[PDB]
Amino acid sequence: LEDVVIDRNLLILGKILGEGSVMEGNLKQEDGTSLKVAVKTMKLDNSSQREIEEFLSEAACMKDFSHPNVIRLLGVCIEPKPMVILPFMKYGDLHTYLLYSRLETGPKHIPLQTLLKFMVDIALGMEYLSNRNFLHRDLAARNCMLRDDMTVCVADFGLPVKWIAIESLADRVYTSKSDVWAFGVTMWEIATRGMTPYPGVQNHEMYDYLLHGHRLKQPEDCLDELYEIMYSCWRTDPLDRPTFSVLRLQLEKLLESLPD
Ligand SMILES: CN1CCN(Cc2ccc(-c3cn4c5nc(ncc35)NCCCCC(=O)NCCC4)cc2)CC1
Ligand SMILES: [Cl-]
Ligand SMILES: [Cl-]
Numbered sequence: 001l002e003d004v005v006i007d008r009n010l011l012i013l014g015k016i017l018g019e020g021s022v023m024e025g026n027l028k029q030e031d032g033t034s035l036k037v038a039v040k041t042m043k044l045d046n047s048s049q050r051e052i053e054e055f056l057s058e059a060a061c062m063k064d065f066s067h068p069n070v071i072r073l074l075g076v077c078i079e080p081k082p083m084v085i086l087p088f089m090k091y092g093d094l095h096t097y098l099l100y101s102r103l104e105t106g107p108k109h110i111p112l113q114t115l116l117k118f119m120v121d122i123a124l125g126m127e128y129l130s131n132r133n134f135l136h137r138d139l140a141a142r143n144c145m146l147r148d149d150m151t152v153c154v155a156d157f158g159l160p161v162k163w164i165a166i167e168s169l170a171d172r173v174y175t176s177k178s179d180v181w182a183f184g185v186t187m188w189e190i191a192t193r194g195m196t197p198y199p200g201v202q203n204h205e206m207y208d209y210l211l212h213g214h215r216l217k218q219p220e221d222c223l224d225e226l227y228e229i230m231y232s233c234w235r236t237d238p239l240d241r242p243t244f245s246v247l248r249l250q251l252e253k254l255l256e257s258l259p260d
């Protein structure tokens with residue numbers, strides 16, 4: 001607590017940004033200046049201090065995370081409900097951004113070079129968490145945030161059937177190679193500019209679908225080289241899947257093989 005806790009009086013809450021749930025707010029910092037934050041309210045099982053122990057545990061680790069492509073944890077505040085304090089990012093989540101991209105008034109058609117750069121950013125972020133054996137367990141375009149410099153950072157980690165790896169559906173187990181699987185789905189979302197995974201397949205059909213060897217199909221405008229990287233993320237054996245440090249360099253290489 002000594003490290004992550006923030007006095008509730010230093011926090012002012014405002015409108016709802018999404019539904020626990022997310023809310024806007026102002027964090028009064030130690031330099032006197034006030035910072036805009038997003039406050040994620042957390043509903044935990046208070047029948048025991050079990051879930052809160054694991055809550056304050058990760059938060060202490062998450063507050064020490066420092067990487068441009070990984071979201072920053074500012075701290076936690078208590079009411080007795082905990083609340084995660086994160087930086088506010090006005091450009092919002094990447095998923096909505098991709099959709100807007102396909103509408104006039106909204107952002108310009110995102111070229112492929114920019115789409116890969118989104119993937120690289122996420123891969124770099126995941127590479128950082130992976131190096132610290134920290135699992136995300138909920139990676140998706142909706143959880144990837146755009147910084148004010150339009151660089152992507154990963155979020156919502158710590159503390160969705162169509163993103164869950166095949167092993168994690170049956171055995172109900174989670175490894176970093178399960179995050180790689182979700183990362184490949186995230187790549188698909190980006191390459192399709194916001195499509196929902198597995199059109200035609202309902203959620204209750206996903207296990208038999210995957211179990212029979214069927215995977216996400218290649219988008220029309222997607223390069224064979226880019227879909228290879230995506231596909232390698234969905235290999236049945238988690239050991240056959242590449243690490244984030246391999247994926248990251250694959251994407252950096254491919255992006256550099258393109259013009260501006
Ligand atoms: C007066 N106006 C208010 C509405 N404005 C537009 C707008 C609306 C919503 C958001 C927004 C939404 N989410 C956000 N998460 C964060 N910052 C902003 C948002 N950081 C925390 C990230 C942690 C992970 C997470 O929860 N991922 C899901 C995204 C949830 C941003 C801008 C215009 C002005
Ligand atoms: Cl308040
Ligand atoms: Cl940050």
Ligand SMILES: [Cl-]
Pocket residue numbers: 194195196
């Ligand atoms: Cl769509």
Ligand SMILES: [Cl-]
Pocket residue numbers: 197198199215216217
């Ligand atoms: Cl599909």
